[PDB]
Amino acid sequence: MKVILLEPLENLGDVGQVVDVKPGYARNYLLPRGLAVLATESNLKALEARIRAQAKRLAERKAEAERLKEILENLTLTIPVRAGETKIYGSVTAKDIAEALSRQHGVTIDPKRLALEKPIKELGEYVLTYKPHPEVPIQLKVSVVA
């Protein structure tokens, strides 16, 4: 008997997988405990309908990740600070590097997705990693200047 597991099950298979079991096990254990559902025709293309929808919404999120990869490795964010020759008096935060980008190139970007562990307290040219979702990182060149 073929069923669609609704959960990972020990030595049976992964969620969404279609495996083959003795009828008594399915209709007396798996099915009354929401563990799987009979691999009928009707709710078979449903699996398809939802594997297709996830394949979409992911690879979309991998394309609204790239509309901001080209549009951010293709500029510099220049942050005028007040400083004496090397070290800043205040500092520049992710929040800072955020409000600044949303100002010049007006690109909304989330400070916490931005690898700034210690706030920047010196002058120079900085490369910084931005992850708006994994496997799609973004290197940001930024110039803090006086």
Binding site: R27, L31, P32, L38, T40, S42, N43
Partner: protein
């Protein structure tokens, strides 16, 4: 054992035919009938309990049509059956036949 609620299978009358002798096809003189008498063949009726709209429903069904019960449970999901008795739920399930 009476009657299948899904398929309508029902007890039937058959003969029990006792034969002696050797079949012609094995070189014997042939088979003789030493008794014919009436008997009954019964559906393999069995019980199937399913929970539907939170209610427990029970079918008396030939083992052959056990899968047809669960099919009815599926097709039942289109209907709103909550609030009805287990009697009225079954009636709905059987109209989907």
């Amino acid at each position: 054992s009476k009657v299948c609620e899904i398929s309508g299978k029902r007890p039937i009358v058959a003969n029990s035919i006792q034969r002696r002798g050797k079949a012609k096809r094995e070189g014997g003189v042939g088979k003789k009938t030493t008794g014919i008498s009436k008997r009954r063949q019964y559906p393999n009726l069995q019980k199937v309990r399913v929970r539907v709209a939170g209610q427990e429903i029970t079918f008396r069904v030939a083992a052959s049509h056990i899968p047809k019960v669960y099919e009815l449970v599926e097709r039942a999901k289109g209907l709103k059956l909550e609030g009805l008795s287990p009697k009225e739920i079954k009636k709905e399930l059987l109209k989907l036949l």
